[PDB]
Amino acid sequence: DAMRAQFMLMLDMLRETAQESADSMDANYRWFHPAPNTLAAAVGSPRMWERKPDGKDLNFGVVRVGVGMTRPEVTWGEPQNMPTDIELEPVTGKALQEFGRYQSVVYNLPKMVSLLVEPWYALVGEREQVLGLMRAIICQLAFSHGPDHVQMIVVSSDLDQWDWVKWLPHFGDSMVYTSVREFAAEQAELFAGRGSFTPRHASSSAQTPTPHTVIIADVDDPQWEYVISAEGVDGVTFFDLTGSSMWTDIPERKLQFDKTGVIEALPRDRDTWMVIDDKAWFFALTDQVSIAEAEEFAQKLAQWRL
Amino acid sequence: PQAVVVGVMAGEGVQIGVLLDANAPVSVMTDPLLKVVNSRLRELGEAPLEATGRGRWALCLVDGAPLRATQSLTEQDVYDGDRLWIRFIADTERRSQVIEHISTAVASDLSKRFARIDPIVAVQVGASMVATGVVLATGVLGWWRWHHNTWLTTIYTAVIGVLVLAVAMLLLMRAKTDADRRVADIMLMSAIMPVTVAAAAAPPGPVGSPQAVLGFGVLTVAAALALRFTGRRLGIYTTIVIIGALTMLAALARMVAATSAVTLLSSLLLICVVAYHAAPALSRRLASSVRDVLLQAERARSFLSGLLTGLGVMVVVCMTSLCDPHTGQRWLPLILAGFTSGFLLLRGRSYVDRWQSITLAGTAVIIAAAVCVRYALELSSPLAVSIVAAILVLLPAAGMAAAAH
Amino acid sequence: WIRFIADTERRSQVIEHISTAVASDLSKRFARIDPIVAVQVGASMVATGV
Amino acid sequence: IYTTIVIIGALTMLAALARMVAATSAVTLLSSLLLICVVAYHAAPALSRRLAGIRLPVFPSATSRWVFEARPDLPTTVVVSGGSAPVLEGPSSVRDVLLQA
Amino acid sequence: GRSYVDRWQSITLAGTAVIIAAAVCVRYALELSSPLAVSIVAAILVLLPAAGMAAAAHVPHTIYSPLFRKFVEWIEYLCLMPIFPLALWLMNVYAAIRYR
Amino acid sequence: LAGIRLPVFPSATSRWVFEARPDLPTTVVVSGGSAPVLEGPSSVRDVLLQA
Amino acid sequence: GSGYGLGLSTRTQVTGYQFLARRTAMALTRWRVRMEIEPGRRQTLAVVASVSAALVICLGALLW
């Protein structure tokens, strides 16, 4: 019993060491990716449009979509000289077993998505959920990335839902379209000229051109096959709000919404964003903003210029 | 009705009168509203309102509750002339914490929400136990005087009274903090009982009216003296003085000459009836510029609460002693008790204080219940108890139903 | 806002100072009785009667 | 408050019952209740633990090997009427201990 | 009482110990009435709780030697060991067996 | 009777801390020597008087 | 699986369970688990000693 009592105490000190490192990660991640409802009050602070493409900023092209599980910055070493399964003491065994299962993950951290890693992201769910998430994504980008670095385009038939977009500067020009034929004449003539998608990384960010393009698809037009079968273009990223079959045929680019607002997708590595498994699973709990909140934030942002 | 004028409170305390749109939803006004108060503060030369880290700007009632962001100002119960408060509420989001091993998990968690014992509380417990100890000691010594006239009761109680008062003096002078004062007050107040019976037990011969004159007299004197030099615990000491004084008058009259107890009881009841109307005036006369006003307000509030308690105790004792199930017009005191209770039952609404209003309301109910019990113990028979039980349960049920329904 | 300025219009244009931290507290520290409290007292009395 | 009523009730019932069917002496009944209470003070923390539903871990009885990293346990979501936005806070196995204690 | 850290849980244990003494003392006066009993009871009933108030206020600020702290621990065990042998004597069990 | 006390405890149920903040030195004055000067830790001065 | 039913058990497991119970019982009353000294058992053995002493006197009386 004296050995058992000593072993339990040794584990508690490891727990205290683990807990402190996790708190440092919480402090840091919140500082770069706040909750969408808090963004308006920060508009006057120097935190707005802080993101830089010049290689040293590891957060460029990253957008917050919700909260979920993530791996801590700790590295656990395997136990040496392990006793055989037929010889283990039953108390310390379960203690060390449970320790490994729960202390290997930290709950309620902000989950993120990277623009520089995929040609598109198919959003599949009911209209109300999908529009909620998309508006949040636009204002998340708008606060963190400057208009000189990000430009945004919407292709939609339900123009009544995008009326609030009018105030934002990222939608300006020297910009919402009704159909692919219309978009093809004005915008595609410029963008279709060259390239295809190419996954980048932080250090590579210094080489890509400054204006990144975000395209939102809300028309379900079959005419899109030209750019999709060509595997897009570099410097562009598409978000499908309809869930059309041409975009929805790739699991590595599909996000599925549950009735409870939980989103499921394939797991990706925290350090390289590379896909690590072939089966879809829990990914993040959805955050969403109203039309009023979007216009309110957009009006506050419209007051400022370079 | 298209707009309402209201006072908005801002940082560190400036109140600004503004005319707000009565039908737009509240979330539409907080931002430009914040600009206006900042503009006036900036021109006034004061420091403007500012954000801190992660959070949001919210509009709340003076109670602090925020208004629903989507509702119209007229949709909420806000009227012209009301006042509101503009405020910043910080973000509460943080990582979740987990502990696997139920033994350590229960220990850590349980230590946060509940308070452990400490040396500060340890003293107040002991102080309460010593007070309880001596009030028991006086009880047995007093019970002995009721069968024996010897000096033992006064002799032994006198030494206790001296000892308890002696110790209390050192505690009062050595005090430093509110905790130290609480302990001192509990100890001194405990000295009143032994000293009181010590005097009353001295007059030889069987116990009665002659001894009663001394007892309620010294009691009233000690309570008044403590209140003068202490100036704290106003309400309780005030109550002891009143009940002691009125009892001394009755004791002196009965001791000198009294044709009947009914005469004295009737006299006391009339004195109390007129005293209720005088109570607020008495309380009011008994009482950097802000300090004088608040001190005056709380001092005045305390005296009325104590004064009302003293009167309430006397009427129920007098009233229940006057009524009788066998003596003469058995129904006369019963209906008289009813009419007397009605005044107290209705007048309770004239005072804003919760405890003052509750004590008045409670004073009437207890008399009615007490009268029925008296008429149930004596003149005992199935009809008497059967009627009293039904009355006692229906009585308050009707009162609450009329108010809640 | 677009508004109708009637000839009768007058505006206060005056401000006053009091510590906001004390005003909010004094709103609940002591005041008149409430119906919920009256109900609780009523419940206690009938319970005492039975 | 309700737990107090059950103990004084149950213990008094047994004393009253024995007095009825066997007419045992007062000195025997009062002294026996004292001895029952002296042991009850030692069992109190153990009785209290099981009444509250605290559950000690079950042992694997040596018919399986230890797995260091199975896929972590799924977090749970919560909802509130006023604070209408749903939130998540942890695994069911851990979230309940804060109420059992 | 030492083993319970929660405020009200520990007070109820100390309170139970004191009330037994007070209740047994009073019982000896309202019966077997006489000057010794009523005088002695009046003394115990006031001195006993007073001694506690002093110890309650004085103990927390002093330092005690480990040989003494180790001694109060053993007072508890010396108090439990006699309960059962005494209760069975009060119940008259030994005589009932010896005269079987 | 002189008040010497001997502390003995299991290191507060904790490991040692070599970098703990040293005790604040006490300031002293004299009627004639009105200019104050500090002499040292309060804990150590008592020993010179207790002895 | 899951330990349901009434399967047999090893003496190593019996003390194992009994240790986790003592540690948890201490947490409910002392709110800590360092347990430099274990008063839970010491107080229990004193009761067991009293019960045993009482039975010894009965054997003496029975033998008499």
Numbering used by the authors:
A (entry chain C3): 101 to 274, 285 to 416
B (entry chain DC): 18 to 304, 344 to 461
C (entry chain DB): 102 to 151
D (entry chain DB): 253 to 353
E (entry chain DB): 404 to 503
F (entry chain D1): 303 to 353
G (entry chain B1): 10 to 73
Please give the exact wording used by the authors of the publication that reports this structure.
Specialized protein transport systems—known as type VII secretion systems (T7SSs)—are central to the virulence of this pathogen, and are also crucial for nutrient and metabolite transport across the mycobacterial cell envelope. Mycobacterium tuberculosis encodes five homologous, but functionally distinct, T7SSs that are designated ESX-1 to ESX-5. These systems translocate a number of effector proteins across the unique and impermeable diderm cell envelope. Here we reconstituted the ESX-5 T7SS of M. tuberculosis H37Rv in M. smegmatis to obtain a structural view of the entire T7SS membrane complex from this human pathogen.
Cryo-electron microscopy (cryo-EM) analysis of the M. tuberculosis ESX-5 complex purified in the presence of ADP–AlF3 showed clear hexameric particles. We performed an ab initio reconstruction without symmetry enforcement that yielded an average resolution of approximately 4 Å, which improved to an overall resolution of approximately 3.5 Å after further data processing; this allowed us to build around 78% of the stable complex de novo. The intact machinery comprises EccB5, EccC5, EccD5, EccE5 and MycP5 with a 6:6:12:6:3 stoichiometry resulting in a 2.32-MDa complex that is anchored in the inner membrane through 165 transmembrane helices (TMHs). The membrane assembly is best described as a trimer of dimers, in which each dimer comprises a single copy of MycP5 and two protomers each of one copy of EccB5, EccC5, EccE5 and two copies of EccD5. In the intact ESX-5 complex, the angle between protomers at the membrane level differs by about 0.5°, from 59.7° between protomers of one dimer to 60.2° between protomers of adjacent dimers. However, at the cytosolic level these angles differ by more than 10° (from 65.3° to 54.7°). Beneath the EccB5–MycP5 chamber, dimers of the EccC5 ATPase assemble into three bundles of four transmembrane helices each, which together seal the potential central secretion channel. At the very centre of the complex, one TMH of each bundle contributes to the formation of a pyramidal assembly that aligns with the periplasmic chamber. Individual cytoplasmic EccC5 domains adopt two distinctive conformations that probably reflect different secretion states. Our work provides a fully assembled structure of the ESX-5 inner-membrane complex of M. tuberculosis.
